[PDB]
Amino acid sequence: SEGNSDCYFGNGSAYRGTHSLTESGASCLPWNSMILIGKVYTAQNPSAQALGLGKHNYCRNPDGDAKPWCHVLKNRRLTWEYCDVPSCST
Numbered sequence: 654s655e656g657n658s659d660c661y662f663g664n665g666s667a668y669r670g671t672h673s674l675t676e677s678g679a680s681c682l683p684w685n686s687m688i689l690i691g692k693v694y695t696a697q698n699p700s701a702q703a704l705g706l707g708k709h710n711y712c713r714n715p716d717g718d719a720k721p722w723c724h725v726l727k728n729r730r731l732t733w734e735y736c737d738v739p740s741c742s743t
């Protein structure tokens with residue numbers, strides 16, 4: 654409402670989040686990215702629907718985690734952290 658600070662309820666499962674980055678890990682690997690060819694969660698994944706992704710880099714909760722998270726690239730290694738989605742609280 655009003656300013657409507659991009660937030661989510663419980664785990665933003667059904668609702669669609671607008672954030673596309675992890676709290677402090679890094680940016681979110683493009684779901685339809687080629688590096689995710691048939692990988693954990695992606696838009697090019699045969700389960701893209703269940704994944705809850707799409708042609709973008711938004712954060713999601715394909716596993717049903719807390720706040721929609723997203724992949725992140727670390728020191729020569731891959732990762733994924735909670736996205737910086739400002740909860741609604743109350």
Ligand SMILES: NCCCCCC(=O)O
Pocket residue numbers: 693694716718724731732733
């Ligand atoms: N719960 C999301 C897991 C995402 C996997 C990312 C990785 O393999 O680093």
